[PDB]
Structures are given as C-alpha cells and as structure tokens.
C-alpha cells in the first residue's frame, strides 16, 4: 500500500544533519522514494546471502556484506 | 584484490566558459600487467530528471596496460547544448569520470557543475532560452564523489 | 538512531514479502539497516546542501536528491 518507513519529522531531522536549512514540500516524497529503492537494493542482495546459504533468518552479517556489495562512496583520494 | 587503483583526479582549466573542453588529470596505478581493456569515460548529466539525457563526451580505450603508476590528461569536448533541456542548463548538474575493466565499471568520480551567467543582467533576467555562449562552467573541484564498486578482476 | 525502528521494520517486511512471503529478519540486522539508511540519507542531504549553497535557490528541491544519486551511480 502507501506504507512508509520514515516519518516527515525524521526527514527534516536528517536534512538538518546534512546542513539543509529549508526543505521543499516535494522533498518528503522524493526522499521516501529514494529510501525505498535503497532498501530494495540492499534487501535483495541480503536475501541471496540467506536463501542461497540455506537459512530463513537474516543475520546482521548478511546485511553487512550486501552493504559492502552496494558500493562505497568516499569524498576524496 | 582490485587490479587498478585510482590515486588522484585534478580538474584543470576550471572555471571556464561552457564551450571549453573538460580537462582532468588522472593518476592511477596497476598492481599487475592488465590483460583486459581499461576504458575511461566522461559523462555529462544533461538532466537530473532522466538518465536518457546523458552525453558521453569521450571514451579512452587503453590496452594492454603495463603495471605501475600512470598519469594522463583526459580531455573531452563540451556537451551538445541542443540535447540539454532548458530547465537543467542553468544551475547545478553533474559530470562523471567512469572507469571500466572488462566492461565492468569499478570506479565513478563525480563532480557537481554550476553553470552560471557572469553578466549581472543575465543573472537578474535570465534569457528565456539558455545562452550557452555566456554561461561559465564552475566545476566544484573541491567536493569530488569517489564511488568504488566490486567487480570481478 | 534518527529513524524509529517499528515503521522502518514494517517497510522492510513489506519489501521482503514483495520478494518472498516466507522471509524473516533479525534485531541486529534491522538496526544495521537503520544505520545504513540513515547515513545514506544524511550523505545525500549533505550533497543537496552543497548544491543549494551554489544556487541562488535556498530551499532544496528533488532535483538535488536526483543529482546526489546520479553522482554515486545509483
């Protein structure tokens, strides 16, 4: 359905932590979209580490290695 | 584990007019003699809305690449304004330096690019259609985004 | 943690059901996903602030989030 995983106040707090002073009303949807995609990409690569490894409970390390798979962004050289 | 390590990128001739070519000084390292192709690309994000307006400005295919530290100036012609949407021409967009090994992109170096008019009149009254001849390109060279991906070497 | 656990876990369960109805998680995995998502979004907003400082615009727009995603290869 329209199920969301992050609240509007949470989005405002996250943007505040990023130095954002003002937020457009359209940001709430946009962030909520990006987050969904992000989770979809991580959970996918986590499920492979669980289903192809013959388990039904997704441990933390499955998520850790899926996150490593996603690709690390640094801010310099 | 990764056969190629990108050490540094320097943005040259920046700021510059829009029509000026991009110039990057790339320093990378090969731990081993490369038997497959190394391919560098510069991609201009014409529109943040959609990937379909990307312009691959140039592509350098290198091979075989001997082991050691290599340095070179990647120069690429400025993007085609006829394919850039007006709404995205003026303001902030992205330029990308991609490298691929055996057809797999293992590193993406991104810069934000602020295209602005320099004449205060055009800044107060921007032309209805962007005048690229009067746009200055400011590559935000101080904030590169270096993203590395796991590939099979 | 800035994102509360329960609604985020509910979204995770919905995605998991969209992939496999018989699926389950762990408390540590849930918290790890929370930290990952929080850091990712904060970095995106840091990029948006970088975009908006250089524009005469002061409010951040969805275009800035799209640009932050494209620079990273997503």
Swiss-Prot record, chain A:
Changing residue 52 to R: In TEBIVANED4; results in severe early developmental defects when expressed in zebrafish embryos. Its main location: nucleus. The modification N6-propionyllysine is found at residues 8, 21, 54, 56, 68. GO terms for molecular function: DNA binding; protein heterodimerization activity; RNA binding; structural constituent of chromatin. The chain holds residues 25 to 101 of 103 of the full protein. It comes from Homo sapiens (Human). There is a cross-link at residue 8 (Glycyl lysine isopeptide (Lys-Gly) (interchain with G-Cter in UFM1)). The modification N6-lactoyllysine is found at residues 8, 54, 68. It comes from the Eukaryota. The modification N6-(2-hydroxyisobutyryl)lysine is found at residues 8, 21, 36, 54, 56, 68. The modification N6-(beta-hydroxybutyryl)lysine is found at residues 8, 54, 68. Keywords: Acetylation, Chromosomal rearrangement, Chromosome, Citrullination, Disease variant, DNA-binding, Hydroxylation, Intellectual disability, Isopeptide bond, Methylation, Nucleosome core, Nucleus, Phosphoprotein, Ubl conjugation. The nucleosome is a histone octamer containing two molecules each of H2A, H2B, H3 and H4 assembled in one H3-H4 heterotetramer and two H2A-H2B heterodimers. The octamer wraps approximately 147 bp of DNA. Found in a co-chaperone complex with DNJC9, MCM2 and histone H3.3-H4 dimers. Within the complex, interacts with DNJC9 (via C-terminus); the interaction is direct. Interacts with NASP; NASP is a histone chaperone that stabilizes and maintains a soluble pool of Histone H3-H4 dimers. One of its GO terms (biological process) is nucleosome assembly. Belongs to the histone H4 family. Changing residue 9 to A: In TEBIVANED1. There is a cross-link at residues 8, 36, 56, 68 (Glycyl lysine isopeptide (Lys-Gly) (interchain with G-Cter in SUMO2)). The modification N6-acetyllysine is found at residues 8, 68. This is Histone H4. Changing residue 40 to Q: In a breast cancer sample; somatic mutation. Changing residue 14 to P: In TEBIVANED3; results in early developmental defects when expressed in zebrafish embryos. Changing residue 9 to L: In TEBIVANED1. Changing residue 9 to R: In TEBIVANED3; results in early developmental defects when expressed in zebrafish embryos. The lineage of its organism: Eukaryota, Metazoa, Chordata, Craniata, Vertebrata. The modification N6-glutaryllysine is found at residues 8, 36, 54, 56, 68. The modification Phosphotyrosine is found at residues 28, 65.
UniProtKB/Swiss-Prot annotation, chain B:
Keywords: Chaperone, Chromatin regulator, Chromosome, DNA damage, Nucleus, Phosphoprotein, Transcription, Transcription regulation. One of its GO terms (biological process) is replication fork processing. It comes from the Eukaryota. Residues 1-153 are annotated as: Interaction with histone H3, CHAF1B, and HIRA. One of its GO terms (molecular function) is histone chaperone activity. Belongs to the ASF1 family. This is Histone chaperone ASF1A. The gene is ASF1A.
From Swiss-Prot, chain C:
The keyword Transmembrane helix does not apply. The modification N6-lactoyllysine is found at residue 20. The modification N6,N6-dimethyllysine is found at residue 20. Expressed in testicular cells. The modification Phosphothreonine is found at residues 21, 48. The modification N6,N6,N6-trimethyllysine is found at residue 20. The modification N6-succinyllysine is found at residues 20, 63. GO terms for biological process: chromatin organization; DNA replication-dependent chromatin assembly; nucleosome assembly; regulation of cell differentiation; spermatogonial cell division. The modification N6-methyllysine is found at residues 5, 20, 63. The modification Phosphoserine is found at residue 27. Transmembrane segments: none annotated. The modification N6-acetyllysine is found at residues 20, 56, 63. It comes from the Eukaryota. The nucleosome is a histone octamer containing two molecules each of H2A, H2B, H3 and H4 assembled in one H3-H4 heterotetramer and two H2A-H2B heterodimers. The octamer wraps approximately 147 bp of DNA. Interacts with TONSL; CHAF1A and CHAF1B. Core component of nucleosome. Nucleosomes wrap and compact DNA into chromatin, limiting DNA accessibility to the cellular machineries which require DNA as a template. Histones thereby play a central role in transcription regulation, DNA repair, DNA replication and chromosomal stability. DNA accessibility is regulated via a complex set of post-translational modifications of histones, also called histone code, and nucleosome remodeling. This is Histone H3.1t. The lineage of its organism: Eukaryota, Metazoa, Chordata, Craniata, Vertebrata. The gene is H3-4.
């Amino acid at each position: 359905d329209n199920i969301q995983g992050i609240t509007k106040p949470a989005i405002r707090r996250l943007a505040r932590r990023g130095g954002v002073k003002r937020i457009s009303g359209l940001i709430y949807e946009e962030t909520r979209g990006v987050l969904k995609v992000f989770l979809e990409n991580v959970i996918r690569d986590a499920v492979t580490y669980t289903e192809h490894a013959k388990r039904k409970t997704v441990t933390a390390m499955d998520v850790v290695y899926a996150l490593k798979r996603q690709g690390r962004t640094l801010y310099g050289f | 584990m990764a056969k190629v390590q990108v050490n540094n990128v320097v943005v040259l001739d920046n700021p510059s007019p829009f029509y000026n070519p991009f110039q990057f000084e790339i320093t990378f390292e090969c731990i081993e003699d490369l038997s497959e192709d190394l391919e560098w690309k510069i991609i201009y994000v014409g529109s943040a809305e959609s990937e379909e307006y990307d312009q691959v400005l140039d592509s350098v295919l290198v091979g075989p690449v001997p082991a050691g530290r290599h340095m070179f100036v990647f120069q690429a012609d400025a993007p085609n304004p006829g394919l850039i949407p007006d709404a995205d021409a003026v303001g902030v967009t992205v330029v990308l330096i991609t490298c691929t090994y055996r057809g797999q992109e293992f590193i993406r170096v991104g810069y934000y690019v602020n295209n602005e008019y320099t004449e205060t009149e055009l800044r107060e009254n921007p032309p209805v259609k962007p005048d690229f001849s009067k746009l200055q390109r400011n590559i935000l060279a101080s904030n590169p985004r270096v993203t590395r991906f796991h590939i099979n070497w | 943690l800035l994102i509360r656990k329960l609604p985020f876990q509910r979204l995770m369960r919905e995605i998991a059901q969209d992939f496999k109805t018989d699926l389950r998680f762990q408390s540590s995995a849930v918290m790890a996903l929370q930290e990952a998502c929080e850091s990712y979004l904060v970095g995106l907003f840091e990029d948006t602030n970088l975009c908006v400082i250089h524009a005469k615009r002061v409010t951040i727009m969805p275009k800035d989030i799209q640009l932050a995603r494209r620079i990273r290869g997503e």
